[PDB]
Amino acid sequence: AEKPKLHYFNARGRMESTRWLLAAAGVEFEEKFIKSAEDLDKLRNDGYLMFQQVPMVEIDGMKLVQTRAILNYIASKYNLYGKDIKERALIDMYIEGIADLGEMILLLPVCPPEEKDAKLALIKEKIKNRYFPAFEKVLKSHGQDYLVGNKLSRADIHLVELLYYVEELDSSLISSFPLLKALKTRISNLPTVKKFLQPGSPRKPPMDEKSLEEARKIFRF
């Protein structure tokens, strides 16, 4: 069948968790990078972006926009979304907390510089006091290797992706959560994820100053 095609900037941004999810599911995909304002204008004008924004993923005849719509579909299609309505509820609750914290971290770079130290301070405090205790509590409550249903789900993938970003930000934040460390290690050793973490995969690097400043110019934001 049609191989999924991801339209995004050549950057992590809002497409990276989709790259993680597809790669962890063992699904081949290709990428079409938006290099210029002209590239974005053309996708807009031609009608392929419902709300004039990317990420956009072509999969199974559809042109999907909205990160959560994209991820929701992929997770169902490849059975990473639980076995029933009640398991989806747990997965949804888990990954929405991950998304909330991920949104903060996602936006720290474009945070105005006079307010950036306090944004970071607050982020670190929510990690140690709100989010990391909540997932450690889940893992300790059942002691199993996966967050939900004793079976790999999107929740494990999204969580461990976030754990890598939190390491980039501050290695010490995970130090008092041994079950999160153990999750990160096990998920990273699943063959599909291990390959995704090795060089040459579609996994994207952190944004750097040159790349951010240049893209701020090209796309005026």
Say how far apart CA 165 and CA 153 lie, in whole Å. 19
Q: Give the CA angle between residues 103, 45, 47 to the nearest 5°.
A: 75
Helix (H, G, I), strand (E, B) or coil at 136: helix
Class of domain 81-189: mainly alpha
Q: In a 10 Å sphere around its CB, with 0-12 CB exposed, 13-18 middle and 19+ buried, how is residue 11 labelled?
A: middle
Q: Is 198 annotated as a binding residue?
A: no
Q: Are strands 30-33 and 56-59 parallel, antiparallel or unpaired?
A: unpaired
Q: Is 44 annotated as a binding residue?
A: yes
Distance of CA 161 to the CA centre of its chain: 6
Closest CA to 154 of 86, 71, 30: 71
* 73-99 burial code (b ≥16 CB/10 A, e <16): bbbeeeebbbeeeebbebbbebbebbb
> After which residues does the chain have a break in its backbone, defined as C to next N over 2.5 Å?
none
d(CA 187, CA 192): 9
Burial 114-125 (b: 16+ CB within 10 A, else e): eeeeeebeebee
Backbone phi and psi for residue 63, each to the nearest 5 degrees, phi listed first: -115, 90
54 is in an annotated binding site: yes
Strands (E), 30-89: 30-33, 56-59, 62-65
Comparing C-alpha atoms, which of 188, 192, 141, 161 is closest to residue 22? 192
Residues written for the chain: 221
**Is 81 within any annotated ligand binding site?**
no
* 7 neighbors 43 (Cβ within 8 angstroms): yes
Question: Encoding tokens for residue 77?
Answer: 């299609």
Intrachain domains 1-80+190-221 and 81-189 with the same fold:
no
Is residue 17 within 8 Å of 72, Cβ to Cβ?
no
Dmax (CA) of the chain = 51
Phi-psi region of 3 (alpha: psi -120 to 50; beta: other; left: phi over 0): beta
Residue type at position 92: D
What whole-number distance in Å separates Cα of residue 184 and Cα of residue 181? 5
The SS3 call for residue 56 is: strand
Cβ neighbours around 70 below 10 Å, total: 24
How far is the C-alpha of 157 from the C-alpha of 183, rounded, in Å?
A: 10
Domain 1-80+190-221: CATH superfamily is Glutaredoxin (3.40.30.10)
CA torsion sign, 93 to 95 to 99 to 100? positive
d(CA 136, CA 178): 8
DSSP secondary structure letter of residue 198: S
Of 179, 90, 100, 87, the residue nearest 133 (C-alpha) = 179
Determine if the peptide bond prior to 55 is cis (ω within 30°): yes
Pairing of strands 5-8, 30-33: parallel
Is position 53 annotated in a ligand binding site? yes
Residue 66 known to bind ligand: yes
Q: Do 166 and 173 form a contact (C-beta atoms < 8 A)?
A: yes
| Helix, strand, or coil (residue 15) | coil
- Domain residue ranges of the chain, discontinuous segments joined by +: 1-80+190-221, 81-189
Output the six-digit token pair for 45. 């004008």
- E strand or H helix that includes residue 6: strand 5-8
- List, edge to edge, every strand of the sheet that includes 62-65: 30-33, 5-8, 56-59, 62-65
Tell me the C-alpha distance between 15 and 70, whole Å.
9
